Write an enzyme that holds these catalytic residues in place. Sequence first.
Site, PDB file in Angstrom:
ATOM      1  N   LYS A   1      -3.516   4.679  -0.218  1.00  0.00           N
ATOM      2  CA  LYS A   1      -2.613   5.691  -0.759  1.00  0.00           C
ATOM      3  C   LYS A   1      -2.891   5.918  -2.216  1.00  0.00           C
ATOM      4  CE  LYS A   1       1.993   5.547  -0.064  1.00  0.00           C
ATOM      5  NZ  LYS A   1       3.420   5.279  -0.465  1.00  0.00           N
TER       6      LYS A   1
ATOM      7  N   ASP B   1      16.915   5.483   4.376  1.00  0.00           N
ATOM      8  CA  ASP B   1      17.292   5.489   5.775  1.00  0.00           C
ATOM      9  C   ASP B   1      16.062   5.626   6.666  1.00  0.00           C
ATOM     10  OD1 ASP B   1      20.465   5.693   5.392  1.00  0.00           O
ATOM     11  OD2 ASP B   1      19.450   6.986   3.936  1.00  0.00           O
TER      12      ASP B   1
ATOM     13  N   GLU C   1      -1.880  -1.675   5.041  1.00  0.00           N
ATOM     14  CA  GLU C   1      -2.189  -1.912   6.437  1.00  0.00           C
ATOM     15  C   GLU C   1      -2.340  -0.597   7.200  1.00  0.00           C
ATOM     16  OE1 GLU C   1       0.855  -4.172   8.371  1.00  0.00           O
ATOM     17  OE2 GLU C   1      -0.257  -4.379  10.265  1.00  0.00           O
TER      18      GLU C   1
ATOM     19  N   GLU D   1       9.771   8.789  11.951  1.00  0.00           N
ATOM     20  CA  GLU D   1       8.537   9.016  11.198  1.00  0.00           C
ATOM     21  C   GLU D   1       8.230   7.883  10.218  1.00  0.00           C
ATOM     22  OE1 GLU D   1      11.190  10.999  11.617  1.00  0.00           O
ATOM     23  OE2 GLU D   1      11.390  12.338   9.871  1.00  0.00           O
TER      24      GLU D   1
ATOM     25  N   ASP E   1       6.807   3.760   4.515  1.00  0.00           N
ATOM     26  CA  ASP E   1       7.329   4.882   3.737  1.00  0.00           C
ATOM     27  C   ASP E   1       8.820   4.746   3.468  1.00  0.00           C
ATOM     28  OD1 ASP E   1       5.020   6.543   3.257  1.00  0.00           O
ATOM     29  OD2 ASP E   1       5.117   7.181   5.357  1.00  0.00           O
TER      30      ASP E   1
ATOM     31  N   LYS F   1       2.198  16.793  -2.837  1.00  0.00           N
ATOM     32  CA  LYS F   1       2.210  17.059  -4.267  1.00  0.00           C
ATOM     33  C   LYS F   1       1.811  15.814  -5.076  1.00  0.00           C
ATOM     34  CE  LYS F   1       5.576  18.239  -7.922  1.00  0.00           C
ATOM     35  NZ  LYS F   1       4.657  19.079  -8.743  1.00  0.00           N
TER      36      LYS F   1
HETATM   37  O1  LIG Z   1       1.506   9.903   3.937  1.00  0.00           O
HETATM   38  C1  LIG Z   1       2.349   9.015   4.041  1.00  0.00           C
HETATM   39  N1  LIG Z   1       2.649   8.354   5.305  1.00  0.00           N
HETATM   40  C2  LIG Z   1       2.017   8.645   6.545  1.00  0.00           C
HETATM   41  C3  LIG Z   1       0.804   9.317   6.622  1.00  0.00           C
HETATM   42  C4  LIG Z   1       0.235   9.561   7.849  1.00  0.00           C
HETATM   43  C5  LIG Z   1       0.871   9.132   8.997  1.00  0.00           C
HETATM   44  N2  LIG Z   1       0.288   9.408  10.262  1.00  0.00           N
HETATM   45  C6  LIG Z   1      -0.522   8.445  10.940  1.00  0.00           C
HETATM   46  N3  LIG Z   1      -1.109   8.801  12.103  1.00  0.00           N
HETATM   47  C7  LIG Z   1      -1.870   7.934  12.766  1.00  0.00           C
HETATM   48  C8  LIG Z   1      -2.064   6.650  12.275  1.00  0.00           C
HETATM   49  C9  LIG Z   1      -1.427   6.341  11.062  1.00  0.00           C
HETATM   50  N4  LIG Z   1      -1.612   5.009  10.570  1.00  0.00           N
HETATM   51  C10 LIG Z   1      -1.164   4.551   9.276  1.00  0.00           C
HETATM   52  C11 LIG Z   1      -0.522   5.202   8.184  1.00  0.00           C
HETATM   53  C12 LIG Z   1      -0.348   4.197   7.244  1.00  0.00           C
HETATM   54  C13 LIG Z   1       0.259   4.257   5.840  1.00  0.00           C
HETATM   55  C14 LIG Z   1      -0.346   5.191   4.875  1.00  0.00           C
HETATM   56  C15 LIG Z   1       0.766   5.571   3.927  1.00  0.00           C
HETATM   57  C16 LIG Z   1       2.057   5.122   4.574  1.00  0.00           C
HETATM   58  C17 LIG Z   1       1.723   4.419   5.834  1.00  0.00           C
HETATM   59  N5  LIG Z   1      -0.859   3.058   7.711  1.00  0.00           N
HETATM   60  N6  LIG Z   1      -1.334   3.259   8.974  1.00  0.00           N
HETATM   61  N7  LIG Z   1      -0.662   7.226  10.409  1.00  0.00           N
HETATM   62  C18 LIG Z   1       2.082   8.463   8.930  1.00  0.00           C
HETATM   63  C19 LIG Z   1       2.657   8.218   7.699  1.00  0.00           C
HETATM   64  N8  LIG Z   1       3.118   8.495   2.940  1.00  0.00           N
HETATM   65  C20 LIG Z   1       3.086   8.930   1.557  1.00  0.00           C
HETATM   66  C21 LIG Z   1       4.147   8.589   0.727  1.00  0.00           C
HETATM   67  C22 LIG Z   1       4.154   9.018  -0.610  1.00  0.00           C
HETATM   68  C23 LIG Z   1       3.084   9.782  -1.107  1.00  0.00           C
HETATM   69  C24 LIG Z   1       2.020  10.132  -0.268  1.00  0.00           C
HETATM   70  C25 LIG Z   1       0.862  10.948  -0.800  1.00  0.00           C
HETATM   71  F1  LIG Z   1       1.124  11.375  -2.040  1.00  0.00           F
HETATM   72  F2  LIG Z   1      -0.212  10.162  -0.808  1.00  0.00           F
HETATM   73  F3  LIG Z   1       0.622  11.982   0.003  1.00  0.00           F
HETATM   74  C26 LIG Z   1       2.019   9.712   1.061  1.00  0.00           C
END
Ligand SMILES: O=C(Nc1ccc(Nc2nccc(Nc3cc(C4CCCC4)[nH]n3)n2)cc1)Nc1cccc(C(F)(F)F)c1
Length: 266
Positions: A38, A132, A87, A136, A150, A19
Amino acid sequence: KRQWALEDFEIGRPLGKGKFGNVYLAREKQSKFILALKVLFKAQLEKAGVEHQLRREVEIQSHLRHPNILRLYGYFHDATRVYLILEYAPLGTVYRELQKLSKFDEQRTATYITELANALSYCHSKRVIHRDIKPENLLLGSAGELKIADFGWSVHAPSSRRDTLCGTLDYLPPEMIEGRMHDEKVDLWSLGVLCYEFLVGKPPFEANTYQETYKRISRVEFTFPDFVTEGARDLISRLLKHNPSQRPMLREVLEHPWITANSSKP
Ligand SMILES: O=C(Nc1ccc(Nc2nccc(Nc3cc(C4CCCC4)[nH]n3)n2)cc1)Nc1cccc(C(F)(F)F)c1
Ligand SMILES: [Mg+2]
């Protein structure tokens, strides 16, 4: 200090959508540095009344420097969006790795617990507020090293966790669910739940209904499967104490005999 703009990035495939925005795999156009972008919608942040909180969180994260905490490299905005440059952790989440392996051996577990304790000690010393920690929230860098991510309260990661519903309750300590004040000692409880889940494949207070899980957490009612070893039982039992003041210091975790014997990271 560089002033970034969207035009500086090659935007790749989405890593997540919700969202509040979208996250993309990306690269800096000039340097080809791989990173994650992001992108949050100002309108949603405003509607939720968390714009201020988010800015505070981003400022705090931008100054942290720890190998096991996901770096926030920079940020910028335009008329309608805020962009956080993060990162990239190429090996995904511990959540997924646990799904793939079902359970972890003592070496992998002790190593992860060491890395998390180190990150948490740094967080405590900087008094970093965080939610917490769950599997994930744990990403894996190029070396298979843990990266906490996150962890801000502002916005919830839109992540298909699948399991049951929410899946957060399993990681919460008694003092939280009972409505008492809490302090940094919640992190020791988290480490205990995580250590158990790593070795067993499921968290210790898991039940078929949340009403049962609330009971089991409140009463610290859990059991070890037969294969869990004496040293692991000792650590976990010391961490999952009802009274937070009875939980050990993070330094005690890092010096625990089971941790020192099994961790690949000294
Ligand atoms: O999607 C998220 N975290 C996330 C996303 C994908 C993954 N899956 C994944 N799979 C393989 C590799 C990988 N590498 C990453 C993921 C990240 C960051 C991106 C955002 C948080 C961590 N850095 N490296 N991630 C894990 C965590 N976090 C997040 C938090 C608030 C709002 C939003 C949105 F509005 F943009 F949607 C998003
Ligand atoms: Mg599970």
